[PDB]
């Protein structure tokens, strides 16, 4: 099913502390929809980390 790879790309790959759930973070849901569409690059997880960091940067703009 889907939950094992989502808990990979949240906890195992992304190394997120679990108390940032889904309901606290909508653009996380908009990013895990495309993070799961690829299967490589799960060794260099810091690229995914700074990708979501620049995404939460660009979403939190007044413009």
């Amino acid at each position: 099913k889907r939950d094992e790879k989502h808990r990979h790309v949240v906890n195992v790959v992304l190394e997120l502390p679990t108390e940032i759930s889904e309901a606290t973070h909508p653009v996380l849901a908009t990013m895990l929809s495309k993070y799961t569409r690829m299967s490589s690059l799960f060794n260099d997880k810091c690229a995914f980390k700074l990708d979501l960091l620049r995404m939460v940067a660009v979403s939190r703009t007044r413009r």
């Binding site: 990013m31 993070y35 690829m38 690059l41 690229a47 995914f48 990708d51 620049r54 995404m55 660009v58």
Partner: protein, 49 residues
């Protein structure tokens, strides 16, 4: 690298779109990523100065 980058199609980069593969390819020497603001002649002169 070994060949010069005369094919212009290996020069592209987007901002604010979550371009995840170019962030995993930040050490890849062959693809080039520019922010599509080509410098004109006078600011080229000022930068050279």
């Amino acid at each position: 690298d070994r060949q010069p980058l005369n094919p212009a199609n290996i020069e592209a980069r987007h901002h604010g779109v979550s371009d995840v593969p170019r962030l995993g390819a930040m050490d890849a020497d062959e693809p080039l990523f520019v922010d599509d603001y080509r410098a004109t002649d006078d600011e080229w002169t000022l930068q050279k100065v």
